[PDB]
């Protein structure tokens, strides 16, 4: 018998090549985590993140009530927290 | 009149309020998955179905973020009819039966959204709600999808009423995502902590490490295995249509071309195959050849011998 | 029991590595 | 005014004034 | 529930033997399935005609 | 039933399930259930009058639709 | 060190341009960024993403569908294998006898079978100087054996 | 007619494969912007960049006049601005 | 006019993103 006479595009190559491409790109997607995890340990080992999620959720709450003036104001807090690493240390302190 | 009353009572009404978008989207994700897997005119059909699943998911996000019950009604009506009309365009199946089934679940949960209503608090990532492990794991892999994160951000920005830009929107999404992941980890460490100067635990190490190694094995070895396995499979029967025995004799003029074709050629049956195999059963490799070749594989060379074709 | 809980925790921190451990 | 209201953040906002 | 297993048989006797008598069996089922719960408690002894 | 048979068979009731029954004031109605029973019966009759070698998944359909009727009659 | 100052400058320029444009055209507070702005940028991004996946497929298929150059049977080898034992009747022809049908000839064939839509379709779809003429030779000499 | 008899290397594959490769690599180049834009919002969300472009342009001016001693000195300023995020906040203040 | 200016602004915003937002 012959070995490859299957159908669906080219069982030999159209879908096959697409599959390979997908795998590779998913490869890079997954590498996107376990490659440069060490380049953030200077802003990722923060302890308590409760105060930051409050900020984030307040932005969401203020967009539902459509008071978008305060959206701009609370976004300003978020970006300054992430602009000064020392204030992140203060805000993410375990207890107070 | 009656139709108008139905629609009025599906819009104005006096019902409750639920958020079943998460489940509707999950149904559509499963649908996408099985259509992608179901590549098996057919490629073109599967590509159109891809564009479709995608476009419909985008429209769904729009109506969810804009909280439109009337829009969802319209979409549902159109989609029901269109998907049911696509059953008539079967010309390019278990895959399609399953696609219909999961789309039926989507239509059921969508119908629920319309007949219930949209809740006031619609914003907020599903996997950033609680800080148990399941939420953590779901959020992780869900975000992991290559373009899902960016699509979510841009899409949401376009519908949600904001004063800011898309970059700004993506910033708050990234911050939130990271903050959630940290919170889940903090919560789990409060729920279950280990002691100081205390080995992390041989077993924990063996587990995580093992999984990582196996995943790496499946990046390199497993594809090779699968590939080779498929290639080894000898797909479809190839039998000599004709038995052309040209007994080239005369050095100057080779002749003796008495030969036969398909009518004389007999594709050996299962019983016939058994006979040949048993004839040469004593010799292991002889029988092996016959037995390994699939039934209706070994063909019979009933070459014609009579002549008339003159020697020249 | 204890072993199962430890295992859970194992694969759990393993998926912690799935989006910045 | 965006141009100006999103670029108005200062240190006084982050003082710990009974932040519950 | 025997009243009802008979209704099942009535349906399937028609289905199996494709004829005109079978259409009649099908109809007899359809009817006594609709108007049936009524005469399951009213034909118990009161005129099982 | 629409996954085992196609065309005019089904594609009327499934459409109506998605667009009428599930999009209604609480419990569908009475007319929905009646039309469901009626359509299923008609389909059975016309498939019996011959599609050839008709299948009967409409038996389990009609009987489930009459079971629900009994459940809602008892309320 | 050189690349550092180049990166810094590049980033600083991009920021400056944005700052300048915000001073040139500012925006108010609590003020919807403007439906249109969103629709524009978002739309462009979506279309760019469409052209990453769909457009290549379209182009690829389009080119493949094009049937490039004419392929006409050089010879008309009609072997009327008759005798079961010894198949013969190999009177056949080649390029001289084979006539690549001209444009006018093609019109004739198409019109002959014009009533039948699909018949005409076949002929018309096949490009002129495509349909070749099978003028197979019938004379013998070659004996049956 | 047959479908692919075109010329120029292999219309079927040499130039075609090269084109695909280019597209992919340009793909990654363009992703290089819209992938990790959020990992810099701690050093890149600065208000006024006028003082930093002055520094950068002074390095350029000092290389044209070939007083390369001051090139080293002004480079030292650039790297310390980018070594301490808090001084960037000070130097990039909107007004003063 | 105003619409055209808004369109230009949107275009800039989009292509602005072309180098780190």
Numbering used by the authors:
A (entry chain A), H (entry chain D): 2426 to 2521
B (entry chain A): 1941 to 1980, 1999 to 2050, 2060 to 2279
C (entry chain C), I (entry chain E): 227 to 247
D (entry chain A): 1408 to 1427
E (entry chain A): 1165 to 1213
F (entry chain A): 1698 to 1747, 1779 to 1803
G (entry chain D): 2135 to 2279
What did the paper state?
PIEZO channels transmit mechanical force signals to cells, allowing them to make critical decisions during development and in pathophysiological conditions. Here, we report several near-atomic resolution cryo-EM structures of fast-inactivating wild-type human PIEZO1 (hPIEZO1) and its slow-inactivating channelopathy mutants with or without its auxiliary subunit MDFIC. Each hPIEZO1 subunit has a curved blade structure, and the three subunits form the trimeric PIEZO channel, exhibiting a bowl-like shape. MDFIC, a MyoD family inhibitor protein, has recently been identified as an auxiliary subunit of piezo channels capable of decelerating channel inactivation and attenuating channel mechanosensitivity.
While the severe hereditary erythrocytosis mutant R2456H significantly slows down the inactivation of hPIEZO1, the hPIEZO1-R2456H-MDFIC complex shows a more curved and contracted structure with an inner helix twist due to the broken link between the pore lipid and R2456H. For hPIEZO1-R2456H-MDFIC, the 2D class averages show a clear trimer state. On the other hand, the hPIEZO1-R2456H-MDFIC shows a smaller disk of 25 nm compared to the 30 nm for the wild type and the other two mutants. The smaller disk is mainly due to the more significant contraction of the blade arms and a more curved state compared to the wild-type hPIEZO1-MDFIC in the side view. Surprisingly, the IH of hPIEZO1-R2456H-MDFIC showed a significant twist of ~35° compared to wild-type hPIEZO1-MDFIC. The coiled-coil shape of the IH pore results in a more dilated pore on the extracellular side, suggesting that unlike the mild GOF E756del and A1988V mutations present in the typical African population and located in the THUs region, the more severe mutation R2456H, which is located in the IH, not only leads to blade reshaping but also results in pore expansion. The hPIEZO1-R2456H-MDFIC presents a more extended extracellular side pore. More robust evidence comes from the HX channelopathy mutant R2456H, wherein the interaction between the hydrophilic phosphate group head and R2456 is disrupted, which leads to remodeling of the blade and pore module, thus significantly prolonging the inactivation time.
